[PDB]
Design a protein around this ligand. Structure first.
Ligand code: FAD
Ligand code: FAD
Ligand code: V55
Ligand code: V55
Lengths: 501, 501
């Protein structure tokens, strides 16, 4: 790599003012919440283009100078490494200034976006034009990116929650600087780019998700029509051990699609950590004991597990399924509550917002849980939607975090037939002993979950290799074959998903 | 290629009785319905393994002897080339003996299948075990394969109609003979292979659809729970020119998911061709005129367009949406009819069967339309679900087929935001002039649709290059890069989707 020559060429493409080339100038791309005891996850440079033509020039220069680019959209991957590259010596390719909304079709319920478009922008666009379409917001929201989240296959809480399922058409800058459009996009004068996902011949959009094979410059998305009627619900379960009964009750409702939105099943500990610090619940050096959790949860109108769903359509379509849903959840020991019961409950308000694709007051209390705070790593293993799987995963996760002196703070995102078990590893990152302990605990979570047949849907830069190691040796070798063929100079995001040149 | 050495080694793997190595032995793999005036689409051999270990040995031999393999599951790609390879000198890898149902999960609504599993087998398995799951049948059916059909991204007529969206997990024999499991399948002891589609890192399952990058040896599929209530409907439109009004009415019902199943919008000409020969409607050498079609259609309880949809769930969920659906379709000039009205109507019976995932009596009347019959090529361009697009596509298709002396016989498969415009080019293949004219007509359909920005979701072995040429040069070159890196010896299905070593 010839860094000085690459950065000088970059200034010629975007201007000196959008190239950041020394320790001091790249401070804005350098903060992470993941454990980094060796301080190895840090960029050496940032370049901020406003056009796809600039992106294509940047990629040609990157090849010529063998200078790797770590590409981000808005770079708000909080708990997954923010804008920190997976390996040393990378320049962040920050696409935040490519923030053009390119198309929105009210009739077909579609849009086409540059990567820099924020949830806030797209919400504002729809409201300002009176377009009765909804977005699907992965908790974070405001200055996060539909494009960046969809490319890391993130999740929101409407019927359109599984973001990658609703992506339709993308444009990619390939490692050699050529643009390719997927699906129907490469047909001159096509009006079906956001209409038909697959195109003809191999389906390649997936290659550009959680990967380093290309730079996405445009992406299409399907958007849900605003329903006549929106009815949010909260189910309260009293006991830490109700986990399997909740999964077993929700699964038939989801498999049969009586409930269509991805459901957050929130632990009392996680909910409390949103608005309270740990030392408001229990003293430092005391465990987060069941009795203290139950008391604090109860005083805040929360159970030990709080599961959020919604019904969408007419008063008549809602009336069609609400009785069966209530009877199933009640039989599981759940108390089903509506907005009228949950007035002024901030958790209900948080979920009520998310399940209509609303944006919440951008405020992340989890970062202040323990001591000086500032430590967050998502450990996000998959499970089949089986109560015994949730039961066993919760039990192993609790044993491992408690062994390292950390708390179990978790939610299940319930899908159709699967579950994202989201485990927030919360620590004091400012205390270098605690950062080291959180690193060791995270390694033990990954290793011991993998030995039971469980592994991550998504991970942070500090664990991408160890999570890749849970999956097959053939998978790893095949992704290396693709990398070497697609990006011969190894200049796109080396070590993303454990994929190294 | 060393054909004799390969075929001798293949006998060692599967036994002499499952290797077919000369003109007369390969006749069962050589019949096609597509136009082939040069008789160029024909295998030189066939091999029929019963195990994935046999497949791996066959692929190792193929690489050693440089002998290409054209892989098929059941090989019933009727109107898309059956088991004919896209290029000369290929041995069919016929996987029909790998017909094991590996898993069926009643609770999660999943299965795992070998490629030879037929629709009939899976239906029988579900009924024999009293498992209240449905399958989703692409018209064809009985002896077709859920695996083969999903790998070519075909379509059925339940809410699970878009087969590739419901695939979850696969095992592939890569060109070097190594097995690789996608999604969660490469995690030893994973119970989530059929639960979570994406896995971790680049999503690769699309690479093995409409492609020659791998041999699929196992595939997971999601299956729809049998609903309490199934209510099939037929909408009858009176005029050939109602096309745009039908699409414009269905689109909001589909975009808002009031109607969740892929809807077949059938031309009177196609319906008549299912049960009648052309010379029962008009004399040979007379055009298939609007008056004659209308008369024959009306005599059979059909309109000029007949659109099929179903409602699934309870009496209450059905009652929730049926009024809005009726009002919308009636306002478009459609007459909405139920089973009670359409008693003994064989078209209603045909669609009523499809839309509950039933299998029809395996009888393909389309193959006897004109003269000696035997000529069928699907021309299957995509459209955005816009009335004006259907209007313009129908108009150009009719002008081109009519200019070559053929009829417009077509259906639209209505999807969420897309249409599959399925044009059946019916011809007398036994008349070598008529086969030549159908070849020329087919070339004119692809080239002139492509000039208007329209191209195929799927195409027969005779047109795979001309359809690839409609899509981008960067797409073509990128698929060649992947082919060369994934299959260095070019031994899997050369020319599939226009992809050549
Ligand atoms: C309290 C809290 C709650 C959260 N809740 C959720 C949640 O419910 N669901 C969820 O999904 N996430 C959640 N997150 C995680 C995270 O904040 C979001 O997923 C966020 O949307 C990701 O940041 P982003 O949108 O800026 O994407 P980016 O950081 O811009 O993109 C993420 C990654 O995608 C790739 N990438 C991005 N753009 C491109 C491009 N143009 N071409 C190629 N590769 C590219 C890169 O690998 C990049 O690191 C949460 C985080 C916190 C702290
Ligand atoms: C009247 C009529 C109506 C039809 N209606 C429909 C319809 O509604 N919907 C529809 O989708 N089709 C329809 N078809 C087309 C066709 O009959 C079906 O799509 C059928 O399911 C395909 O044949 P098959 O299942 O045997 O798959 P195969 O022919 O076995 O597979 C198709 C292709 O997939 C690939 N392939 C298959 N197995 C593998 C493997 N294991 N590894 C790698 N590649 C593999 C090969 O390219 C192969 O040619 C219709 C045909 C007719 C004549
Ligand atoms: C379902 O995905 C996620 C959810 C959250 C918080 O609910 C954090 C990270 C994720 O990846
Ligand atoms: C939706 O796909 C298809 C449908 C049909 C129905 O005649 C035939 C071939 C196809 O590919």
């Amino acid at each position: 790599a010839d860094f000085a020559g690459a950065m000088k060429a970059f200034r010629g493409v975007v201007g000196a003012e959008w190239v950041f080339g020394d320790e001091e100038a790249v401070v804005p791309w350098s903060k992470t919440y993941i454990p980094d005891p060796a301080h190895q996850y840090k960029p050496v440079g940032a370049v901020c283009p406003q056009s796809v033509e600039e992106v294509q020039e940047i990629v040609r220069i990157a090849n010529t100078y063998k200078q790797p680019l770590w590409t981000v959209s808005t770079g708000k991957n909080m708990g997954y490494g923010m804008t920190a590259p997976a390996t040393p010596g990378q320049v962040v390719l920050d696409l935040k200034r490519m923030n053009r909304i390119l198309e929105v079709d009210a009739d077909l319920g579609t849009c086409l976006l540059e990567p820099g478009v924020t949830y806030q922008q797209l919400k504002d666009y729809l409201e300002e034009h009176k377009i009765p379409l909804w977005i699907d917001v992965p908790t974070v929201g405001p200055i996060a990116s539909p494009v960046g989240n969809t490319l890391d296959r993130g999740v929101g809480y409407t019927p359109y929650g599984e973001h990658f399922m609703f992506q339709c058409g993308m444009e990619v800058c390939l490692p050699d600087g050529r643009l390719m459009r997927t699906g129907m996009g490469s047909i001159k004068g096509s009006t079906a780019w956001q209409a038909f996902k697959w195109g003809y011949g191999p389906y390649l959009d997936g290659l550009f998700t959680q990967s380093n094979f290309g730079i996405v410059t445009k992406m299409g998305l399907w958007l849900m029509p605003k329903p006549p009627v929106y009815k949010p619900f909260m189910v309260r379960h009293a006991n830490m051990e109700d986990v399997p009964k909740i999964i077993e009750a929700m699964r038939p409702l989801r498999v049969s699609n009586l409930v269509a939105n991805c459901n957050l099943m929130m632990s009392a500990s996680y909910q409390l950590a949103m608005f309270k610090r740990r030392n408001e619940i229990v003293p430092d050096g005391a465990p987060l004991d069941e009795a203290s959790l139950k008391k604090a949860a109860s005083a805040n109108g929360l159970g030990m597990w709080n599961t959020y769903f919604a019904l969408y359509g007419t008063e008549q379509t809602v009336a069609g399924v609400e009785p069966i849903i209530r009877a199933t959840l009640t039989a599981s020991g759940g108390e089903v509550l509506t907005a009228a019961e949950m007035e002024g409950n901030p958790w209900f308000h948080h979920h009520q917002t998310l399940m209509q694709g609303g944006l919440n007051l951008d405020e992340v209390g989890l970062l202040r849980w323990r001591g000086a705070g500032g430590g967050l790593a998502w450990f996000a293993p998959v499970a089949a939607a089986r109560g015994v799987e949730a039961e066993r995963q919760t039990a192993l996760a609790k044993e491992i975090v408690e062994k390292h002196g950390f708390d179990y703070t978790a939610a299940y995102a319930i899908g159709w037939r699967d579950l994202h078990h989201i485990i927030a590893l919360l620590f004091d990152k400012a205390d270098p002993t605690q950062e080291q302990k959180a690193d060791a605990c995270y390694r033990e979570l990954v290793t011991r979950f993998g030995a039971q047949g469980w592994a991550s849907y998504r991970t942070g830069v500090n664990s991408m290799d160890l999570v890749a190691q849970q999956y097959g040796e053939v998978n790893r070798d095949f992704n290396r074959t693709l990398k070497r063929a697609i990006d011969p100079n190894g200049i796109l995001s080396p070590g993303k998903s454990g994929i190294h040149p």
